[PDB]
Structure 1
Amino acid sequence: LELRLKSPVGAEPAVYPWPLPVYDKHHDAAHEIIETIRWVCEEIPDLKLAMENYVLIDYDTKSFESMQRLCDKYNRAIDSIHQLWKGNTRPSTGLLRHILQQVYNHSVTDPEKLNNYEPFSPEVYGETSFDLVAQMIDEIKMTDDDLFVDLGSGVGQVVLQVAAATNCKHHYGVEKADIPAKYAETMDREFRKWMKWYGKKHAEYTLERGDFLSEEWRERIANTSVIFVNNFAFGPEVDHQLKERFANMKEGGRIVSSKPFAPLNFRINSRNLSDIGTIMRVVELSPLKSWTGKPVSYYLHTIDRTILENYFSSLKNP
């Protein structure tokens, strides 16, 4: 009582039990199977030739026999292609969206347990966050010298997306809450397994449980080159403590957030020398400035102590 999908790169097969797991009101494992097959067919043109036309539309998700026949036809077509080949790149954006959703559906079995009613919740990642994170990746252009940290990483979705798209030395996700941090452990295993199944490359990453406001995390923030933080619902105290942590970052250190940490129009004077605006540039970025999603904006902060230095030089030399 199971369905098996052979890996296009010879990794362990994907095994699903029957009856197939139900994900949410509108998605299930049956549709994930058909979409997986269709993605592999795009990835391998020979496979599309080896597979008969009708097979990827003439199926019945409510029938074991029909689902088994679909799986069989794909498995046999993958077998002939492996026969032809007898004789590790980053995933495309479309495949990655599919992989992240697949990883989530296999990891977060109980969605009520998450208790996230907020916008940008793990449950709606594909609809809201995925495209926005992709636009953010294109805008900040990270290299192998960069270290990326998502402060309050939930189930680790942003970290997985960034690790699958960039060549940062390392990507970290830190989450305090027990339930998301526990789900993140499964997300991590499911992501590595599925990426191996597709034969797709990703950078090194770590998902960990912890408080980003802890003593251990003070020096970790100071050594981070790119911080991602959804500070939208942060209270003044968490916001205050975070600014203190950012104050130890290196020149050129960057912070990508949902609310700015300093005003966009900050003008250094004698009365505001204690403000974070004295040591960081801030710009409002928006995909609307070929975006067709929500009219969102995000904030890029760049550590630059010359703001403070130029002010002191202006006072000594008028």
Structure 2
Amino acid sequence: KLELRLKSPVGAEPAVYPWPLPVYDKHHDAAHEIIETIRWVCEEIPDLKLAMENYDYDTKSFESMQRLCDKYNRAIDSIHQLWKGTTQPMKLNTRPSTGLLRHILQQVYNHSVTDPEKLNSPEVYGETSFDLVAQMIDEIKMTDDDLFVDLGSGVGQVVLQVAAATNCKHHYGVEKADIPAKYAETMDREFRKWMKWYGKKHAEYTLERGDFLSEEWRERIANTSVIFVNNFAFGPEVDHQLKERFANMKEGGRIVSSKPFAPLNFRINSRNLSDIGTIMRVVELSPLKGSVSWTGKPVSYYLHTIDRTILENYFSSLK
């Protein structure tokens, strides 16, 4: 029946929406996905922006929606034309800006998480931690050297965010529970599709089914240089096993978490000598003012860097 279609700015399969356009949740529907996508594409292509200094808008009239899609598609055609002339294509494979990325990931999520219901009351998945993760990404400089892992990666959004944002040799997510691992497969597909659609590049990444305490993971963890773990509700048993597995990490390796694995007020003495606190610097990271603020209360986060010289110094300090 009735449809709206958006042409990709790089000639990928157009995006096709049914009318009336679905609503996703109380604060998201396809209408606004459509508008937001159009706006984002104008940011990729200043030229497209120039073509469309015309658009507030009526999202419940199909006619009003279709003029918008039409103007956009037509300007797209116009742009593709320009690129046959001496004007060169928009720089091919760049990373998406943050703004675009937040959009894309919203899009991927909504197209992948059909029924946001099979996900338990409490924020045990982190639904709007995008800005938070974005902050982390800003602070923890990463490079083609690093390997990244999100321990208990959920449906994968954080892995996708980092992979989109950084140039690690590889990013990994590992998830035990079956239903989110299922969703992650679609997330993965949706993500690849939308990134092609906007013609934006991403670092290599993999989503996996697995337990991060499983024998196999001991080795991998020791090999990972950047670990993100949202351990807020892990408690005693699991924190310990993790500390265990961290102790084998190379010098420089980083762990970013919600609960600290050492303490910050930690100075090295006779009976704390096998405490992990001896092989790692720990800092409290500044929270975001607009923090999701778990437990109706402002909460911050922790960067641990594997630094053995801390130990070495305590053996130099015995002459």
Query: Normalising by the residue count of structure 2, what TM-score does the alignment of the two structures yield?
Result: 0.90
Question: Compared with structure 1, are the counterparts of its residues 74 and 171 closer, same or farther at alpha carbon in structure 2 (3 Å cutoff)?
Answer: same
SS at 1:105 equivalent: helix
**What is the CA distance between 1:14 and its match in structure 2?**
0.9
CA contact (8 A) 2:23 2:29 kept: yes
Question: Compared with structure 1, are the counterparts of its residues 110 and 127 closer, same or farther at alpha carbon in structure 2 (3 Å cutoff)?
Answer: closer
Map 1:228-307 to 2 at 5 A.
Answer: 228-287=228-287, 295-307=298-310
Question: Compared with structure 1, are the counterparts of its residues 66 and 294 closer, same or farther at alpha carbon in structure 2 (3 Å cutoff)?
Answer: farther
**What is the CA distance between 1:16 and its match in structure 2?**
1.5
SS at 1:299 equivalent: strand
SS at 1:114 equivalent: coil
1-structure distance, mates of 2:82, 2:235: 60
Deviations 1:247-302 (A, max 9, x none): 11111111001111001011221111221112111111114699999954210111
2-structure distance, mates of 1:183, 1:151: 17
Alignment match of 1:90 (pick from 92, 95, 100): 95
Moved more, 287-296 or 85-94: 287-296
CA contact (8 A) 2:253 2:305 kept: yes
Moved more, 242-251 or 286-295: 286-295
CA contact (8 A) 1:149 1:173 kept: yes
1-structure distance, mates of 2:243, 2:181: 24
Moved more, 79-88 or 282-291: 282-291
Gaps of 5+ in 2: 86-92
2-structure distance, mates of 1:91, 1:302: 28
CA contact (8 A) 1:184 1:207 kept: yes
What is the aligned residue count? 308
**What is the CA distance between 1:157 and its match in structure 2?**
1.2
CA contact (8 A) 1:181 1:209 kept: yes
2-structure distance, mates of 1:291, 1:38: 32
CA RMSD of aligned residues (A): 2.8
**What is the CA distance between 1:38 and its match in structure 2?**
1.0
CA contact (8 A) 2:264 2:283 kept: yes
2-structure distance, mates of 1:177, 1:291: 23
Deviations 1:105-133 (A, max 9, x none): 111111111226xxxxx989998412221
CA contact (8 A) 1:253 1:302 kept: yes
Deviations 1:226-266 (A, max 9, x none): 00000110121100000010011111111001111001011
CA contact (8 A) 2:287 2:301 kept: no
Question: Compared with structure 1, are the counterparts of its residues 302 and 274 closer, same or farther at alpha carbon in structure 2 (3 Å cutoff)?
Answer: same
Moved more, 229-238 or 129-138: 129-138
1-structure distance, mates of 2:98, 2:157: 14
Deviations 1:61-104 (A, max 9, x none): 22333322221211111011111111221111111111111111
Moved more, 156-165 or 12-21: 12-21
Question: Compared with structure 1, are the counterparts of its residues 242 and 25 closer, same or farther at alpha carbon in structure 2 (3 Å cutoff)?
Answer: same
SS at 1:315 equivalent: coil
1-structure distance, mates of 2:39, 2:104: 13
CA contact (8 A) 1:174 1:211 kept: yes
SS at 1:300 equivalent: strand
SS at 1:150 equivalent: strand
Question: Compared with structure 1, are the counterparts of its residues 234 and 292 closer, same or farther at alpha carbon in structure 2 (3 Å cutoff)?
Answer: closer
2-structure distance, mates of 1:49, 1:30: 23
1-structure distance, mates of 2:37, 2:50: 17
2-structure distance, mates of 1:124, 1:160: 18
1-structure distance, mates of 2:62, 2:169: 45
CA contact (8 A) 1:173 1:207 kept: yes
Gaps of 5+ in 1: 117-121
CA contact (8 A) 1:286 1:296 kept: no
SS at 2:318 equivalent: helix
2-structure distance, mates of 1:307, 1:52: 59
Moved more, 238-247 or 67-76: 67-76
2-structure distance, mates of 1:10, 1:123: 39
SS at 1:240 equivalent: helix
Question: Compared with structure 1, are the counterparts of its residues 288 and 72 closer, same or farther at alpha carbon in structure 2 (3 Å cutoff)?
Answer: closer
1-structure distance, mates of 2:199, 2:185: 21
**What is the CA distance between 1:308 and its match in structure 2?**
2.2
1-structure distance, mates of 2:66, 2:118: 33
Number of the residue aligned with 2:90: none
CA contact (8 A) 2:227 2:255 kept: yes
**What is the CA distance between 1:39 and its match in structure 2?**
1.0
**What is the CA distance between 1:18 and its match in structure 2?**
2.3
Number of the residue aligned with 1:104: 109
2-structure distance, mates of 1:52, 1:94: 20
Deviations 1:180-231 (A, max 9, x none): 1111111111111111111111111111111001001110100000000001
